[PDB]
């Protein structure tokens, strides 16, 4: 289904997990948008008020779409594919402990997977792909998209 039909995309952070330093949320989501723009024609800018394309949300339990969070573990996060309104939005379970590192749940790695969803990608059956449906920590410092990921996103864009 959907793909954005424009090159300039905006995101807004709804609120911040108390799990992390503010700046570290900003940076993690920024780095995660850079992953996809590296391999597409898209450009991603953080606006701080009004309607973004992609709204980034921290929330627990019933948070008012249909995709209720399940407490700590299980479903870590979910996102909507492109489209108007809620399309694009990416939602992180505040019942997880979000981190900049190997501990709890790495927000960067998770945000990369969700932005893939915000962008029109589904899951991959490759355990090496960031779009594989099982969260596995890998060094974020040397993180690199799997070739499966690149083919899938370039299947939609560019």
Q: Taking CB within 5 to 8 Å according to partner kind, which of Ca ion, Zn ion, ligand KLH, none is near residue 109?
A: ligand KLH
Q: Taking CB within 5 to 8 Å according to partner kind, which of Ca ion, Zn ion, ligand KLH, none is near residue 106?
A: none
Q: Which of 20, 29, 79, 89: binder of Ca ion (CB under 5 A)?
A: 89
Tell me the HSE value of 77 on the side-chain side, using a 13 A CA sphere. 30
Q: Which residues contact 13 (CB under 8 A, 6 or more apart)?
A: 25, 26, 29, 46, 56
Query: Measured from the CB atom, is 47 or 65 closer to ligand KLH?
Result: 65
**Chain-centroid distance, C-alpha 38:** 15
State the Cα–Cα distance between residues 130 and 114, nearest whole angstrom: 10
State the Cα–Cα distance between residues 110 and 28, nearest whole angstrom: 10
Query: Measured from the CB atom, is 38 or 45 closer to ligand KLH?
Result: 38
Catalytic residues: 114
The nearest distance, CB 37 to Zn ion, in angstroms, is 20
- Our finding on whether 39 is near ligand KLH (CB under 6 A) is no
For binding to Ca ion (CB under 5 A), which residues are involved? 19, 70, 74, 88-89, 93-95
């Amino acid at each position: 289904g959907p793909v954005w039909r424009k090159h300039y995309i905006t995101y807004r952070i709804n609120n911040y997990t108390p799990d992390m330093n503010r700046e570290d949320v900003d940076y993690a989501i920024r780095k995660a948008f850079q992953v996809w723009s590296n391999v597409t024609p898209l450009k991603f800018s953080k606006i701080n008020t009004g309607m973004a394309d992609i709204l980034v949300v921290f929330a627990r339990g019933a948070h008012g779409d249909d995709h209720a969070f399940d407490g700590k573990g299980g479903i870590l996060a979910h996102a909507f594919g492109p489209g108007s309104g809620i399309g694009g939005d990416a939602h992180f379970d505040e019942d997880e402990f979000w981190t900049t590192h190997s501990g709890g749940t790495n927000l960067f790695l998770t945000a990369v997977h969700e932005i893939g969803h915000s962008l029109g990608l589904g899951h991959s059956s490759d355990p090496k792909a960031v779009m594989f449906p099982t969260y596995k920590y890998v060094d974020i410092n040397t993180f690199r998209l799997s070739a499966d990921d690149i083919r899938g996103i370039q299947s939609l864009y560019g």
